[PDB]
Design a protein around this ligand. Structure first.
Ligand SMILES: Nc1nc2c(ncn2[C@@H]2O[C@H](COP(=O)(O)O)[C@@H](O)[C@H]2O)c(=O)[nH]1
Ligand SMILES: [Mg+2]
Ligand SMILES: [Mg+2]
Ligand SMILES: [Mg+2]
Ligand SMILES: [Mg+2]
Ligand SMILES: [Mg+2]
Ligand SMILES: [Mg+2]
Ligand SMILES: [Mg+2]
Ligand SMILES: [Mg+2]
Ligand SMILES: [Mg+2]
Ligand SMILES: [Mg+2]
Ligand SMILES: [Mg+2]
Ligand SMILES: [Mg+2]
Ligand SMILES: [Mg+2]
Ligand SMILES: [Mg+2]
Ligand SMILES: [Mg+2]
Ligand SMILES: [Mg+2]
Ligand SMILES: [Mg+2]
Ligand SMILES: [Mg+2]
Ligand SMILES: [Mg+2]
Ligand SMILES: [Mg+2]
Ligand SMILES: [Mg+2]
Ligand SMILES: [Mg+2]
Ligand SMILES: [Mg+2]
Ligand SMILES: [Mg+2]
Ligand SMILES: [Mg+2]
Ligand SMILES: [Mg+2]
Ligand SMILES: [Mg+2]
Ligand SMILES: [Mg+2]
Ligand SMILES: [Mg+2]
Ligand SMILES: [Mg+2]
Ligand SMILES: [Mg+2]
Ligand SMILES: [Mg+2]
Ligand SMILES: [Mg+2]
Ligand SMILES: [Mg+2]
Ligand SMILES: [Mg+2]
Ligand SMILES: [Mg+2]
Ligand SMILES: [Mg+2]
Ligand SMILES: [Mg+2]
Ligand SMILES: [Mg+2]
Ligand SMILES: [Mg+2]
Ligand SMILES: [Mg+2]
Ligand SMILES: [Mg+2]
Ligand SMILES: [Mg+2]
Ligand SMILES: [Mg+2]
Ligand SMILES: [Mg+2]
Ligand SMILES: [Zn+2]
Lengths: 110, 118, 148, 153, 99, 279
RNA sequence: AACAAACUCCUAGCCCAAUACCGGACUAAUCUAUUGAAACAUAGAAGCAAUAAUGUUAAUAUGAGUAACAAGAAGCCUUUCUC
RNA sequence: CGAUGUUGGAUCAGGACACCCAAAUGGUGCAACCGCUAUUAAAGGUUCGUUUGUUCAACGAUUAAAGUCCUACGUGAUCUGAGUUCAGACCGGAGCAAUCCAGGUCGGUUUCUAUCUAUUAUAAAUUUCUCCCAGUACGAAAGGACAAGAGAAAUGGGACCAACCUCACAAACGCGUCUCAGAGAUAAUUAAUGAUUUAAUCUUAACCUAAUUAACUCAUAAUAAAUCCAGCCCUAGAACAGGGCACA
């Protein structure tokens, strides 16, 4: 179908400035207690998850460095230690992931 | 006293009030007797509503109109009143409201025979 | 057009003509030329009529300026503070005299649409109509259905 | 009418949906923590929960062996499951996995993201939403009510 | 074009407004508009409807006097009509010539 | 003040969450829960279908007088099954705090004559209905959403194979050429299903006392596990069946004898029956 | 009775409607001949005036942020899975 | 004529009554049953097939009946193209020919993304067929009732999965199951009382009356507690909305 008359700018303003087509405000914005950045209340902090993701990428790269095959997987459990740490007696019998940087404040020993 | 309304002539049965609800088969022609039986203020409301000029002030000035079927007015409305307009029609009285002074004052036109039965 | 332009009521400023009449025109300044042919009527008006106009109206100040201008003008300023430009370009001497007399006989207010052709202060001599000025009073001031 | 439907439409059909969720489950088993779209991870959570229950049935169970053979498409992960994941999950009945909502992707799609992981993985912990401490005002005022209830019994 | 035509209709609209105002202020005294007009003319009082509405709005006692004059002229004309004679000529039925 | 949104579980800690968690008269109707459906059999051999309506928490809430509600019959307010405190509104919790009861799901109004009024805050039970009676059932039906005209109104469709192009489910012509518009009564695609409907003249067969279950005959409008408004039948043939009912309302305390576990209509084949044979 | 015109009086005047065709008085904007020099006068010339040709060129609107377009998954990032 | 796209059907139907059925009556050369006419009433219906492109028409089986029309002889920005109404081609005929046909046959592109108006669900049933009435009333017999009362169905409206069936999702669905209503009011037509016209006479004479179709309204039923709403679920949903998240 073809339009019969040109829509005027008054009707166009009424259509395009109507509150259902406007961007609604978000009231769930909160400050992160750890880093002081911004996050939503039901969503993890992007800054903290970027830290966790980069450390996870470093761990995964260094454990892929130790194993030279794509089809070889560990039979036993994996533990990770940083510089200046030794494997515990309960951690023996598990494969060892050594990293040169110091252990983070957020990451515990366990 | 809207319930005590009077029509001249046979308008009570001849005069109709009609409306359409918009839906097909929704045409209602109700006789004025039936419409006054159902809603007493409808006759006077529609008469004033039709007689008022067809501008947009019409709804506003029917918002100042108050119609009551009998003599039962709220006291807030009653304390607002200023004067009462005279009725446009002089109400004829029946035989029983005429006093006997007027009955013997009106002369007897004819003399009936004594042998007749009434 | 009344809806297009502005409107003012009929108003005499400072209540003119009530106690005495004050000619509310203050000054005229003519800007003309000695050389241009369009200033001919202004030149003849200056030669004949300006001195007689000054004798007839002692309350106005008349300035004449022959300067190298192409369009002859006259500027009239009033007691109200109003300034009014007028073009006297290429007109006869009687036309110039009529224009100056019409500027002299004016009060100086803005020439727009007048809402009403009269002005009055205190028009309510012997009362003004209110809905109770003709309605008789009831004994006791009673309402129609109020009982005492 | 979608009344009583628990499976959402994904991929190019039911077979493609099963294959994509198989790929996601294989990646989750191999890496123990993966991020994807919210709906795919939400569908993946039930498969990852029942895969641990099938691994609990033992290495010698033929039905579980063929289920893991089909679902774990990389063949090294079946000994990894049956000798890592099933012995590690013994006590708890259904608390195998964690699902969290990641913020939107920095690509132009702005899709809604979720991360899925297993308990006890050898990875740094995610920034979990921590509750208020018990020294907070409302918590202390409610501990006062708890103390008066304990003193009333 | 509408400005010129409504300028033509302005006099008619204002005249209709004046007739409505005179009808209102005369029916407020219980005298009809045509009776009021013709009995005011029969007393040789020539006030136009503009100034009659002006008296009606701003001048209640004077308009009451004019309505009383019109009612007196109407009753005098009715009495002279029912008399059927030329000998009784009233105090307000006399005709004044120019001088 | 750009105040952020909050809920009941935001500022609570894990030690405090389980602490927080720890002749012409008319009768009063009920709010029940549609459990499911069952077969039932009669002594003449026929098979009927019963819908299970379980009363869980039924209490009269407030009483609106005759002259303040309709001018003919008074209004009694009845609540449904019990829901959480934290997800209701502030005025609702305030008025239920004044009343004395936990929050209800659905709130309904019953038209009740002045001789059948019940003091507010009074519970109600399925023994309010006796075995053998006729009831009217009101509920929100199964919402089918924005449905086409074929499913919504029942229109015959155009054929599928005989050349028809993009037409097979469309209504077709909707109005008339001369009138230059379409009538307000035109059947047109739109929302179907989520509306309040009442089934009339449903027979009750059996009342189960301990779980407070009414067995009604036929189909109850609405999906399973919704709330159902039950009243007596307002059909003209069933007007005067109020006399043999416990009519202030059912009072278990005032009788001081126990009712039987399962109350039957006299035509029902019982689960404990002689396994009937003909003669 | 009344209310009711482009009719007719009243007070001023610049003192009586119009299509095709015909007549007349002025005039917007340029160039030139002489004036003029805060932009004009008297004349001589014309590419001498656009609310309209499904007009031409250019830019914008409306239809419309509508119709319509695309990159298989994870990760250690180019290594493995599903077709 | 700088386009108002044309027959039949498919879907959806709005309206009129000059009514086909259903309902209330009057006259009959009306004994009863079949009938023929005349009045009132349009809330609801008015079938399935063969041939033909058909509207019509013939025929087979039915039904309470298979109504007459208007609606751009409704409806192609919803559809179909068989025929008409292009270009190809035959047969009969006319014309020397090209060509011609309210003369027949085969085949023959049916576009649109909706700008504006308009519109996008409240109910409060209807009709048949059996048993009795009784082979009673009425009749010379053949024949053969009306009204009242019990039941079943079907149609239409509103709904729903305990079982059957579709069913490899917990759901949807019919081919399956449940429910369906009181009062007033009337038009035509019969009567009761009684004047003008002391007889009578249903009264565009009053007063009170009844017997009475369909509509149409109203009893009655539904909705009918204002401001917590981040996230998660849903038998709730295009979006927005709506219901749950203390038991466990
Ligand atoms: N032949 C003729 N045509 C006339 C005459 N007057 C007016 N017309 C025609 O009338 C039309 C205009 O009528 P109007 O619109 O002026 O009433 C034009 O077609 C015009 O040619 C006349 O006198 N003779
Ligand atoms: Mg897709
Ligand atoms: Mg004039
Ligand atoms: Mg739904
Ligand atoms: Mg079909
Ligand atoms: Mg086709
Ligand atoms: Mg198709
Ligand atoms: Mg096509
Ligand atoms: Mg129209
Ligand atoms: Mg006049
Ligand atoms: Mg004239
Ligand atoms: Mg002419
Ligand atoms: Mg020139
Ligand atoms: Mg040109
Ligand atoms: Mg231009
Ligand atoms: Mg164009
Ligand atoms: Mg143009
Ligand atoms: Mg745009
Ligand atoms: Mg978009
Ligand atoms: Mg659009
Ligand atoms: Mg699209
Ligand atoms: Mg692709
Ligand atoms: Mg044409
Ligand atoms: Mg056109
Ligand atoms: Mg129809
Ligand atoms: Mg019949
Ligand atoms: Mg008729
Ligand atoms: Mg019909
Ligand atoms: Mg057929
Ligand atoms: Mg047609
Ligand atoms: Mg025709
Ligand atoms: Mg015609
Ligand atoms: Mg067609
Ligand atoms: Mg088409
Ligand atoms: Mg069309
Ligand atoms: Mg053909
Ligand atoms: Mg072919
Ligand atoms: Mg469309
Ligand atoms: Mg639209
Ligand atoms: Mg019978
Ligand atoms: Mg026999
Ligand atoms: Mg049905
Ligand atoms: Mg008699
Ligand atoms: Mg008789
Ligand atoms: Mg109602
Ligand atoms: Mg909600
Ligand atoms: Zn952070």
């Amino acid at each position: 179908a073809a339009p019969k008359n040109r829509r005027s700018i008054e009707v166009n303003r009424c259509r395009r400035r109507n509150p259902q087509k406007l961007i609604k405000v978000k009231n769930n914005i909160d400050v992160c207690p750890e880093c002081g950045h911004l996050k939503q209340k039901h969503i993890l902090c992007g800054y903290c998850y970027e830290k966790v993701r980069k450390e996870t990428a470093e761990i995964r790269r260094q454990m892929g460095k130790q194993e030279g095959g794509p089809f070889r997987a560990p039979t036993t459990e994996t533990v990770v230690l940083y510089s200046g740490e030794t494997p515990s007696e309960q951690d023996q019998g598990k494969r060892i992931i050594e990293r040169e940087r110091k252990r983070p404040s957020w990451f515990t020993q366990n | 006293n809207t319930r005590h309304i009077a029509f001249s002539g046979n308008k009570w049965e001849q005069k109709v009030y009609s409306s359409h609800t918009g839906y097909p088969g929704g045409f209602r022609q109700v006789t004025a007797a039936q419409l006054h039986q159902k809603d007493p203020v409808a006759i006077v409301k529609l008469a004033i509503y039709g007689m008022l000029p067809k501008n947009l002030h019409r709804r506003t000035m029917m918002q100042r109109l108050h119609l009551f079927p009998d003599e039962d007015i709220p006291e807030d409305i009653l304390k607002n009143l200023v004067e009462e307009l005279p009725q446009p029609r002089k109400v004829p009285r029946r035989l029983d409201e005429y006093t006997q002074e007027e009955i013997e004052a009106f002369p007897r036109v004819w003399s009936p025979p004594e042998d007749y039965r009434l | 057009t009344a809806r297009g332009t502005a409107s003012r009521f009929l108003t005499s400023v400072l209540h003119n003509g009530l106690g005495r009449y004050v000619q509310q025109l203050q000054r005229l300044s003519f800007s003309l030329s000695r050389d241009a042919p369009s200033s001919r009527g202004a030149r003849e008006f200056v030669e004949r009529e300006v001195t007689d106009f000054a004798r007839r109206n002692p309350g106005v100040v008349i300035y004449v300026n022959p300067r190298p201008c192409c369009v002859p003008r006259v500027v009239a300023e009033y007691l109200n503070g109003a300034v009014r430009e007028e073009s006297i370009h290429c007109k006869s001497v009687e036309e110039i005299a009529a224009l100056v007399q019409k500027l002299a006989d004016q009060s100086g207010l803005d020439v727009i649409r007048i809402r009403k052709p009269f002005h009055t202060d205190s028009p309510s001599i012997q009362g003004q109509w209110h809905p109770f000025t003709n309605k008789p009073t009831t004994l006791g001031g009673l309402r129609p259905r109020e009982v005492q | 009418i979608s009344h009583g439907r628990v499976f959402r439409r994904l991929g190019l059909g039911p077979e493609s949906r099963i294959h994509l969720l198989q790929n996601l489950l294989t990646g989750l088993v191999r890496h123990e923590r993966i991020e994807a779209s919210w709906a795919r991870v939400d569908e993946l959570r039930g498969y990852a929960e029942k895969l641990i229950d099938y691994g609990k049935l033992g290495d010698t169970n033929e039905r579980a062996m063929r289920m893991a053979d089909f679902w774990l498409t990389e063949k090294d992960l079946i000994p990894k499951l049956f000798q890592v994941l099933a012995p590690r999950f013994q006590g708890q009945n259904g608390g195998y996995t964690r699902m969290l909502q990641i913020p939107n992707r920095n690509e132009q799609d702005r899709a809604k993201m979720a991360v899925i992981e297993y308990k006890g993985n050898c990875l740094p912990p995610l920034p979990l939403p921590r509750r208020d401490s018990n020294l907070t005002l409302l918590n202390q005022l409610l501990q006062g009510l708890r103390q008066d209830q304990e003193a009333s019994s | 074009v509408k400005c010129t035509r409504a300028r033509r209709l302005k006099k008619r609209s204002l005249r209709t407004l004046w007739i409505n105002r005179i009808t209102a202020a005369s029916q407020e005294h219980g005298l009809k508009y045509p009776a009021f007009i013709i009995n005011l003319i029969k007393c040789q009082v020539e006030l136009n409807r503009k100034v009659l509405a002006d008296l009606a709005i701003y001048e209640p006692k004077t308009f009451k006097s004019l309505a009383a004059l019109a009612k007196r002229r109407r009753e005098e004309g009715f009495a002279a009509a029912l008399g059927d004679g030329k000998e009784p000529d009233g105090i307000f039925s006399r005709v004044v010539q120019h001088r | 003040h750009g105040k952020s949104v909050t809920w009941w579980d935001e500022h609570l800690s894990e030690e405090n969450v389980p602490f927080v968690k720890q002749p012409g008269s008319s009768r009063v109707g009920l709010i029940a829960l549609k459990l499911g459906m069952m077969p039932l059999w009669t002594k003449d051999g026929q098979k009927h279908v019963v819908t299970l309506l379980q009363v869980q928490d039924c209490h009269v809430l407030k009483y609106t007088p005759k002259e303040n509600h309709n001018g003919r019959m008074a209004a009694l307010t009845v609540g449904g099954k019990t829901v959480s405190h934290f997800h209701k509104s502030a005025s609702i919790l305030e008025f239920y705090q004044e009343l004395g009861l936990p929050p209800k799901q659905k709130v309904k109004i019953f038209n009740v004559t002045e001789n059948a009024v019940i003091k507010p805050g009074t519970p109600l039970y399925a023994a309010h209905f006796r075995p053998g009676q006729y009831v009217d059932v009101t509920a929100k039906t199964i919402g089918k959403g924005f449905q086409g005209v074929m499913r919504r109104w029942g229109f015959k469709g155009q054929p599928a194979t005989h050349g028809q192009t993009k037409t097979h489910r469309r209504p077709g012509a909707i109005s008339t050429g001369d009138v230059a518009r379409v009538w307000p009564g035109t059947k047109m695609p739109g929302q179907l299903g989520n509306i309040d409907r009442t089934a009339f003249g449903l027979k009750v067969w059996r009342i189960n006392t301990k779980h407070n279950i009414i067995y009604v005959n036929g189909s109850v409008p609405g999906h399973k596990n919704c709330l159902v408004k039950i009243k007596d039948s307002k059909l003209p043939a069933y007007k005067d069946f109020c006399k043999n009912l416990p009519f202030p309302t059912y009072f278990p305390d005032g009788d001081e004898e126990a009712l039987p576990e399962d109350l039957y209509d006299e035509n029902v084949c019982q689960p404990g029956a002689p396994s009937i044979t003909f003669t």
